């Protein structure tokens, strides 16, 4: 029995040191996630005025066509 | 008992083996959305060049024609 | 305690499979990111030398 | 004492993975409005080609 007594607590504290390092990952992965949806919400505020920009293009030259044309006649 | 101790041991085992599964995704996501975080600050930058260069370039369209 | 552990894996898978599909839709945000890239590249290229034409044009018609 | 530690870990650790469902949801709901975003950007950037191309071939014949 004693050794099984003994081979039982250290199972018991290898469990218990399992917990702690699911601990610190979990720790991690949520930090990391925060830190990826802040970028995300970051990089969706570049794409903002990039899609604002291709407007913009479209609009100026769809303004420098008519010119070109009125141009050439 | 033994038995009992074992099995769950091996349960927490395997149960953070799938917590580091977990963890390495998010690790790897944060990567992933940092490098393309780099491609859109070239975009966002070619982009405002383009929007300049065609507002000058309309702007001398109309020029033109007056 | 078993019991609880094993609805705790449960969690964890389900979370699993829920970032496995995360990381599909991020990598093709970056084929998408790519390709955009190329052609914003292209794109401000292409208003360089139209505005180069276009300022010629102010000249000859002005 | 170990068993008390054992436990709440477990139950905290639970509560955190909760969290990160949470957190893995919003992640790919942002990133499925990001990727309609950027391709509606895509669009209007081939469009954009396009139209750039026109005009820098009809200026080119102009000058
Ligand atoms: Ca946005
Ligand atoms: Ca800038």
């Known amino acids: ?73 | 008992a033994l038995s009992e101790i074992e099995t769950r041991h091996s349960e927490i085992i395997k149960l953070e083996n799938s917590i580091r599964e977990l963890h390495d995704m998010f690790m790897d996501m944060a990567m992933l959305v940092e490098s393309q975080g780099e491609m859109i600050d070239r975009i966002e930058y070619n982009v405002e060049h383009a929007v300049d260069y065609v507002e000058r370039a309309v702007s001398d369209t109309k020029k033109a024609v007056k | 305690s078993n019991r609880r552990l094993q609805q705790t894996q449960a969690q964890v898978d389900e979370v699993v499979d829920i970032m496995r599909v995360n990381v599909d839709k991020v990598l093709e945000r970056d084929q998408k990111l790519s390709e955009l890239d190329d052609r914003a590249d292209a794109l401000q290229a292409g208003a360089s030398q139209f505005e180069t034409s276009a300022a010629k044009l102010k000249r000859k018609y002005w | 004492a170990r068993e008390n530690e054992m436990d709440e870990n477990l139950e905290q650790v639970s509560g955190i993975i909760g969290n990160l469902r949470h957190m893995a949801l919003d992640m790919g709901n942002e990133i499925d409005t990001q990727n309609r975003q950027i391709d509606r950007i895509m669009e209007k950037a081939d469009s954009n080609k396009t139209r750039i191309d026109e005009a820098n071939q009809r200026a080119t014949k102009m000058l």
């Not at chain 1, 899609?51 to 044309?69: F, P, R, S, T």
């Open chain 1, 1 to 73: 029995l004693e050794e099984m007594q003994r081979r039982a607590d250290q199972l018991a504290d290898e469990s218990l040191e399992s917990t702690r390092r699911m601990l610190q990952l979990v720790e991690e992965s949520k930090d990391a996630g925060i830190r990826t949806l802040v970028m995300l919400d970051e990089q969706g505020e570049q794409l903002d005025p990039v899609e604002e920009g291709m407007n913009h293009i479209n609009q100026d030259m769809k303004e420098a066509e008519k010119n070109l044309k009125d141009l050439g006649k």
